[PDB]
Design a protein around this nucleic acid. Structure first.
Ligand SMILES: Nc1ncnc2c1ncn2[C@@H]1O[C@H](COP(=O)(O)OP(=O)(O)O)[C@@H](O)[C@H]1O
Ligand code: BEF
Ligand SMILES: [Mg+2]
Lengths: 95, 86, 107, 463, 93, 98, 88, 107, 93
DNA sequence: ATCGGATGTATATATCTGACACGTGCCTGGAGACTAGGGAGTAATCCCCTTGGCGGTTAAAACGCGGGGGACAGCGCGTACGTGCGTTTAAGCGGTGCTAGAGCTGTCTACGACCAATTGAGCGGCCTCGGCACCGGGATTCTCGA
DNA sequence: TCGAGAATCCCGGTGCCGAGGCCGCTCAATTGGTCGTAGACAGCTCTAGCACCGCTTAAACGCACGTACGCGCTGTCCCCCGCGTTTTAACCGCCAAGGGGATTACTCCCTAGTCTCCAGGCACGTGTCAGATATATACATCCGAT
C-alpha cells in the first residue's frame, strides 16, 4: 500500500505541473445558465464566454486555497477547515 | 421558445473537482465541511460577474453574451483576464 | 516626394502612426504633441522585448520551440519586477508556479 | 516741582532723578500716560518705585498695581521694592499649575496684597482670574514685546482695565515708525486709535524727498510727552565706551563646508535656509552634526584649530587673565554655548551659564554668586534674549559680542548691560567679525537701521 | 471588417530577440491584450496628469512622467533611457 | 491596603476611550522630521506645506489602524489574545502586498 | 562635558515612539501587545511612507515646482487605491 | 425674454449648467447629449440626500446640532450599502467604530 | 483665480432635508470631495461604455447603465427611479 | 539504520495530425506639403508663506521593581479522513439539422456644435451671534477585596 | 457573602470663535439663429448556437478499514502590565530673513486641417513540420524484514 500522506504529494506534483481545466464542462455550463436566468430570461452564450467564466472561477478558487493553506499552517495544523476560509475572506476585504 | 431550470445544479462542482482545485493550490489534507462553503463562495462570485455581464449585454441591445462582455465585467471588478480579446 | 515612415526614422519595430491615431481618436486629450507617440511606441517595445526574452529562455528550459502560455506564466511569475507589474492579471490556460509549503514535506 | 528730594523712600535720590520724578507727578496730574524712555543705566526702576509710594503716601490709593517684566529680571524688582519702600507688599507669581491657585484664590483674591509682579508669559496663561480687579497701572517693563500689532501679548493687553499705563521702556523705535504708534496706541486710545491715519499723519518719515521738516511735524506732539536724556549730560558711568572690530579669517575646513552651501556639493543635511546656515558655519564649524572626529566623545586642544575664532577668542582671553579682569560672553544661537561650556571645562576655567530654560530658581543663585566680592568665576556665558534684558552685572567690565543679530539694537540693548551705574573699571567692548564672509553684510545692514534713528531722531529728540 | 491587432509587430520583435523561436496562437492573443493594457494604463495616467496641471496637450514629457510612475523598480531606468534615445535620434532626422 | 486594578481592565477602558475620540495618536514634530528625512533621499532639498504633512499623517494612521485590526483577527484565530510579529507578517501576506 | 555629541540624527524612525504604537493598537482593537511588534511596525510604516512620498515627489518634479502641496499627496494616495477625502 | 434656469425646469438643486460644462470640457466624450446632465444632477442629488439624512440622525442622537466628520464616519460605516460603495475611502478626523471582539470581554 | 466648490448646493439640500441642523465647514469640504469623486466615477464608466459600443456620444441611456454598474444593490432602484422622474419632468418644458 | 523489491514516472522512438509560416491581392489609412492661429514659453513684478531657532510651560516618554496570567510543551485519546475496490452513469464525441439573431448597408432627419448679444446667480470679503468647549463641582455606577 | 473607593456621566455658568448672513462685483449660463453629420430604421446574408440522437469508456459514488492528527488537559515559566517618580522634549508664541508661487502681457511657433498620392497591413489559399500520442523500455523512489 502507501502511507496516508503520499498520494497527496504525488497529486500535488501532478496538478501543479499541468495546465488543463479541473471542472467538467457541462455541469459548469448548466450552473452558468441557471444563475443567468434570474436576471434576464432567454439569454445566449458564446462558447468562449463559458470558457472565460470557467477560467476566472478556477483562478479565483485556486488563489483562495493558497491563502487558506497559509492560514491553516499559521494555526499549527495541516488541514483546512471552514473558519480558515471565512478568515481568509474577512482579511482580504470581500465579505 | 421554451425554458427550464433543472436539478439544482450547484451539485455539479463535485467532490473530486473541489479536491483537484485544492491539490493544485497547495493544500494537503481537506476537511469534510469545506464543501458547502466552497459551493457558496463560487455561487457568490458567479452571481457578481454574470450580473455585470448581463448589464452590458442588455445595454447594447444584443442577447448573445459575447466574450468581450464577460471580459469587461472582469476588468470592472479588478481581475483582468488576458487571452480572449480587448 | 516619396515616403519615409516614422518607424524607420526613430529606428523602431513597433509602429508610430497607429499609436498616434489611438491617441488622437480615443480622447485622451484634445491636442497631441508630435513627440509623444515615438516615446510611447519605444516603451511598449521595451516591455514586449523583456517578456519575450524571458519567455524564450523559459521555453528553451523545457526544449520546445513554440512559446505557449504556460511558459508566459512561468516567465512572468518567476521574475519579481514583472510580477509586481502584473500582480492582478489572470492568464488563461495559466498554470501555477510549483510551490510546496515547508511543513507539508514528510517528517 | 518737588525741590526737597522726598526721603519717604528708605534710600537716596539723585539730582537728575528728581527732575525725572517731576515728569511723572504731572502726567497723572493731567490724566495722561507716558513713556519713561531714558537711555539705559540711569535707574528707571527707582523713578518707578518712588512714583508708587508717592501715590500711597500722598494720593493714598493702596491699589493692586500690576507690573510685568521679563523672566530674568523679576528678582531684581522685589529686592529694590524692599530695599527702598519696605512698607509695600509684593509677589513673584511663579510656580507650577498647582502653586498659582493658592496665590490667586487664597492669597490674592481676598484683598490680601498690594503689588503683583507677573511675567510676560504667565499673564497669558492666568488671564482669567486677573481680569476681575480694576488696576491702577500696568507698569510694563522692557516694552519691546508690544512692537507687533497682532501679537498674542499685545492682544491681551487691550482687555485689562485700569487708570493709566506707564509703558516704561528702554529704547525708542527699532525698525519702522509703524512701531512707535503701536506703543502709543496701547498707552492712550484717545490719541489715535487709528492705523491708516498714522502712516501719513506726518508723511511717513521721508519716503518722498528726505526733507528734515518731516521729522519736525512729528516732534511737536511727543517731545513734551516722552522723556529721554543724554548720557554725557548725566555722566552715567563717568566714562565713555569703545567699540572695537576684530577681522578674522576662515579656516579651510569650514571653507569646504562653505562651498557645499553655495554650489551645494555628516553630509546631506537640511540646508533649506541660506542666511541661517552660513551664520553657523562662519562662527563655529561643528554645528553640522558630525565634524567632530574620531571617538563618539573626546575633546582635544585642537578645538581651537578648526574654529576660526577660538584662537582669536582665547588669546584675547589669556590677555585678560594677565590683566586681572572678568568678561561677559554673549551669543545669539544657544548651541554655540555648548561648545564654549565644554571649552573652559577643558582648559580649566570656571563659569556660569544663563541659557533660556535653565530654571527659575537657578537663575537666582547664579547672579548672587557671580556678583559676590572675591568670587572668581572668570567667564559668564549668556544669551541675548534671555540674559541681556536688565540683570545687573556691575562686577564685570569687558564684553565679547560673539556675533551680530539682525536687530542692531538687540546688541545695543546688551552692550550697555554691565556698563551702568556702579562700574568703575574700563569697559572694553569687542566684536568678532569674520572678514570676507556673510556676517559683514549683516553688519552692513545693521549700520543703516541705527543711523536712521540715532542720527535723525536723536538730534531732533534733544531739540 | 479588419481588426487592429499586433501580431506582426510582436513577431518582428521575437525574431530579433531569439532567432529560431515560433509562437503559438493563444500566446499571440495574450501579447495583443498585454500591449493594449499597458497602452491604456500609460495613456490614462498621462491624460489625467495633463488635466491636473490645467494644461491641454500630451507632450512626450507627460509620457515620461507616466512611465516613471507606473513601471516599478529597475524597469523605469531602462524604459526612460530607451525612450530618450528614440526621441533624440528622431529629432536629428 | 493599596488599590491596584487587574491585568485586564485598564486596557479595556483605554479601548473604549480611544474608540470614542479622534485626535492624532502620533505626535507632530517627530513625524515631520520623519517625512522630511524620507523625502531627502528622492529629490534633495524640497519644501513642504503644512497641510500635506497633515495628509501623510492621516493616511498613515488609517493604514496602521486597519493593519492592527487584521492582525487582531488572525491572533484571535490562532487561539491567543496577544499579537505577535508572525501575525502582522501573515496579515500582510494575505492581502497581496508582498 | 560631552553634551553636544548626543544630538545626532537618532535614526528618526524612532520618532514613532512606543506609546504611539500602543495607542494605535489600543484604538484598533488589540487588548494585549507583545514586545516585538515595535521593530516590525516601524518597518511597515517606513515602507508605506516611502511609496506615498515617491509618488508625491514625482508629481511635484513634473510641474517644475519645489513645494509639495496637499493636492499632490491626495493624488498620490488616489493613485494607489486608498482614497483620502477632506483636502481637495 | 427673461432667463429661466434649467435647474428650475428640472426641479433639482444642482447646477446643471456646471455639470454640462464639466462634461464637455473633461474630454469624457466627443459630444454630450442633452439628456445626460439632467440625469446626472439628479443622481448626485439623491446620493447627497442619503448621506445627509443618515448624518443628521446620527448627529442628533448625540445632542449636537452640527455635522462634524465623526458623524459622517458613523453614518457611512453603519449602513451596509454605503459601506459597500465607500470601501477603500478614508475620511479624515474620522475615528473608528466601537468594535471589540467577543473574547476580550472579561469573565 | 477662484476656487469653486459645491458648498451652497449641499447647503440647500441640507435645508430641504432637515429644518435647522446646520453643517460645519470641514464636513462641507468632505461633501465637496465626495461629490467630485462620484462624478468622476460615473463619467468614466459612461465614457468607456460609449467607447466600447463604437459610438461617439453620451446619452441618458449610458448614464443609466453606469448608475446600474456603480451604485450597489438597492441604491440602484431609487437612483434610476429618480433619474427617470427628473428627466420626464424636464421633458415637457 | 539498511537491501529486496514493487510500483510510480520518464524517456527514446514511430505515425499521423492539424497548426503554423509563407505566397499573393486588395485597398484604406499613412506620409506629405501648404496654410491658419491659438496655446504655451518666457521675462517681469510682487507678496504671501516657509524655515530655523529660541523661550518658557507642562504633559508625556522612560526606568525599575514587583506580580499574576497567558504562551507553550507534553500526554492521552477519540474520531474523522485517506486509500483502496467495485459498480454505474453521465460526460465527452461526432455528427445532423434547424433557425434566431448579428453584422453590414443604404437612406433620410432630427439633434447637438458654433457664435453672438446679454444679465443675473455665484463668489470673495466683511460683521455679528448661537453652539459649544471647557470647567469645575455633584451624583451614579463598576471594580475589587472580603 | 456584602462594603469602600476611583472612573465616568451630568449640570450650570462662562466666554469664545467659527458659522450665517449681507454687500458689491463679474464672468459664465440662457436665448436665439444657423448648419452638418452621427444615428435610427427597414432590409438583407449568413453563421454560429441550440436541440437532439446514439456510442464508449473513464470518472463519480458508495462502502469498509487503519490510523495520523485535532483537541482537551495540565503543569511550568517567563514576561508583559500596572504603578509610581523622574528627565526631557514637544508646543505654542516670537523674530528676522528671502526663495518661490502666483499673476500678467508679449510674442512665437508647433499642431489642426485641408487635399493628394501610394504602399504597408489584412485577408485568403497552400506547403510543411513541430508536436500529440501509443509502445516499449528504463530509472527513481516508497516501503518493508534483520
Ligand atoms: N539713588 C541711587 N542710589 C544708589 N544706586 C542707584 C540709585 N539710583 C539708581 N541706582 C542704581 O541703578 C541700578 C538699577 O538701574 P536700572 O533701573 O537697571 O536702570 P535702567 O532702568 O536704565 O536699566 C542699580 O544697580 C542701582 O545701584
Ligand atoms: F532693564 Be535694566 F537695564 F536691568
Ligand atoms: Mg530696569
Amino acid at each position: 500500500r502507501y502511507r496516508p500522506g503520499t498520494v497527496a504529494l504525488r497529486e500535488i506534483r501532478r496538478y501543479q505541473k499541468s495546465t488543463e481545466l479541473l471542472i467538467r464542462k457541462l455541469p459548469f455550463q448548466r450552473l452558468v445558465r441557471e444563475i443567468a436566468q434570474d436576471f434576464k430570461t432567454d439569454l445566449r452564450f458564446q462558447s468562449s464566454a463559458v470558457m472565460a467564466l470557467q477560467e476566472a472561477s478556477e483562478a479565483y478558487l485556486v488563489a483562495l486555497f493558497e491563502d487558506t493553506n497559509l492560514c491553516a499552517i499559521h494555526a499549527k495544523r495541516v488541514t483546512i477547515m471552514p473558519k480558515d476560509i471565512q478568515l481568509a475572506r474577512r482579511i482580504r476585504g470581500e465579505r | 421558445r421554451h425554458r427550464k431550470v433543472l436539478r439544482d445544479n450547484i451539485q455539479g462542482i463535485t467532490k473530486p473537482a473541489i479536491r483537484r482545485l485544492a491539490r493544485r493550490g497547495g493544500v494537503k489534507r481537506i476537511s469534510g465541511l469545506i464543501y458547502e462553503e466552497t459551493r457558496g463562495v463560487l455561487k457568490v462570485f458567479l452571481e457578481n460577474v454574470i450580473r455585470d455581464a448581463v448589464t452590458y449585454t442588455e445595454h447594447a441591445k444584443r442577447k448573445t453574451v459575447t466574450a468581450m462582455d464577460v471580459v469587461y465585467a472582469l476588468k470592472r471588478q479588478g481581475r483582468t483576464l488576458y487571452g480572449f480579446g480587448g | 516626394a516619396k515616403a519615409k515612415t516614422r518607424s524607420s526614422r526613430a529606428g523602431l519595430q513597433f509602429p508610430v502612426g497607429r499609436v498616434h491615431r489611438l491617441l488622437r481618436k480615443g480622447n485622451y486629450a484634445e491636442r497631441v504633441g508630435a513627440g509623444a507617440p515615438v516615446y510611447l511606441a519605444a516603451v511598449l517595445e521595451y516591455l514586449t522585448a523583456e517578456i519575450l526574452e524571458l519567455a524564450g529562455n523559459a521555453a528553451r528550459d523545457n526544449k520546445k520551440t513554440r512559446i505557449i502560455p504556460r511558459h508566459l506564466q512561468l516567465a512572468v511569475r518567476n521574475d519579481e519586477e514583472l510580477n509586481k507589474l502584473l500582480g492582478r492579471v489572470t492568464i488563461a490556460q495559466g498554470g501555477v508556479l510549483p510551490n510546496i509549503q515547508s511543513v507539508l514535506l514528510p517528517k | 516741582q518737588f525741590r526737597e528730594s522726598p526721603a519717604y523712600v528708605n534710600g537716596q535720590l539723585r539730582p537728575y532723578q528728581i527732575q525725572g520724578v517731576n515728569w511723572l507727578v504731572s502726567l497723572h496730574k493731567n490724566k495722561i500716560a507716558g513713556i519713561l524712555a531714558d537711555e539705559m543705566g540711569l535707574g528707571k526702576t527707582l523713578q518707578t518705585i518712588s512714583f508708587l509710594g508717592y501715590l500711597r503716601y500722598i494720593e493714598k490709593i493702596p491699589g493692586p498695581f500690576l507690573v510685568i517684566a521679563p523672566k530674568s529680571t523679576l528678582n531684581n524688582w522685589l529686592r529694590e521694592i524692599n530695599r527702598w519702600t519696605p512698607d509695600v507688599n509684593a509677589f513673584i507669581l511663579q510656580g507650577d499649575k498647582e502653586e498659582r491657585a493658592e496665590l490667586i484664590q487664597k492669597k490674592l483674591l481676598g484683598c490680601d496684597f498690594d503689588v503683583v509682579i507677573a511675567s510676560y508669559e504667565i499673564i497669558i496663561r492666568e488671564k482669567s482670574p486677573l481680569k476681575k480687579i480694576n488696576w491702577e497701572y500696568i507698569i510694563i517693563d522692557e516694552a519691546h514685546r508690544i512692537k507687533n500689532e497682532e501679537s498674542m501679548l499685545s492682544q491681551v493687553l487691550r482687555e485689562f482695565t485700569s487708570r493709566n499705563r506707564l509703558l516704561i521702556t528702554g529704547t525708542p523705535l527699532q525698525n519702522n515708525l509703524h512701531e512707535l504708534w503701536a506703543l502709543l496706541n496701547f498707552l492712550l486710545p484717545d490719541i489715535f486709535s487709528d492705523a491708516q491715519d498714522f502712516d501719513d499723519w506726518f508723511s511717513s518719515e521721508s519716503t518722498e524727498e528726505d526733507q528734515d521738516k518731516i521729522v519736525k511735524q512729528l516732534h511737536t506732539v511727543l517731545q513734551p510727552f516722552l522723556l529721554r536724556r543724554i548720557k554725557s549730560d548725566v555722566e552715567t558711568s563717568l566714562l565713555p565706551k569703545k567699540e572695537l572690530n576684530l577681522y578674522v579669517g576662515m579656516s579651510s575646513m569650514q571653507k569646504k563646508w562653505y562651498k557645499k552651501i553655495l554650489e551645494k556639493d555628516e553630509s546631506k543635511t537640511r540646508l533649506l535656509n541660506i542666511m541661517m546656515q552660513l551664520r553657523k558655519c562662519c562662527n563655529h564649524p561643528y554645528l553640522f552634526d558630525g565634524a567632530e572626529p574620531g571617538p563618539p566623545y573626546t575633546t582635544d586642544e585642537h578645538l581651537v584649530y578648526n574654529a576660526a575664532k577660538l584662537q582669536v577668542l582665547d588669546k584675547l582671553l589669556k590677555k585678560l587673565k594677565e590683566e586681572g579682569s572678568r568678561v561677559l560672553i554673549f551669543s545669539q544661537m544657544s548651541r554655540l554655548l555648548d561648545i564654549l561650556e565644554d571649552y573652559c571645562y577643558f582648559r580649566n576655567y570656571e563659569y556660569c551659564r544663563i541659557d533660556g530654560s535653565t530654571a527659575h530658581e537657578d537663575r537666582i543663585q547664579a547672579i548672587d554668586d557671580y556678583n559676590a566680592p572675591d568670587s572668581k568665576k572668570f567667564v559668564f556665558l549668556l544669551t541675548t534674549r534671555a540674559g541681556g534684558l536688565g540683570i545687573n552685572l556691575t562686577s564685570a567690565d569687558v564684553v565679547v559680542l560673539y556675533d551680530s543679530d539682525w536687530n542692531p539694537q538687540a546688541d545695543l540693548q546688551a552692550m550697555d548691560r554691565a556698563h551702568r551705574i556702579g562700574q568703575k573699571k574700563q569697559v572694553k567692548v569687542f566684536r568678532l567679525v569674520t572678514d570676507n564672509s556673510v556676517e559683514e553684510k549683516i553688519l552692513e545692514r545693521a549700520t543703516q537701521k541705527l543711523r536712521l534713528d540715532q542720527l535723525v531722531i536723536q538730534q531732533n529728540r534733544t531739540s | 471588417t479588419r481588426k487592429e491587432s499586433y501580431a506582426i509587430y510582436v513577431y518582428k520583435v521575437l525574431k530579433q530577440v531569439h532567432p529560431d523561436t515560433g509562437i503559438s496562437s493563444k500566446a499571440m492573443s495574450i501579447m495583443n491584450s498585454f500591449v493594449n493594457d499597458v497602452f491604456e494604463r500609460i495613456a490614462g495616467e498621462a491624460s489625467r496628469l495633463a488635466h491636473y496641471n490645467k494644461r491641454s496637450t500630451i507632450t512626450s514629457r507627460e509620457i515620461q512622467t507616466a512611465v516613471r510612475l507606473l513601471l516599478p523598480g529597475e524597469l523605469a531606468k531602462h524604459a526612460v533611457s530607451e525612450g530618450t534615445k528614440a526621441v533624440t535620434k528622431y529629432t536629428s532626422a
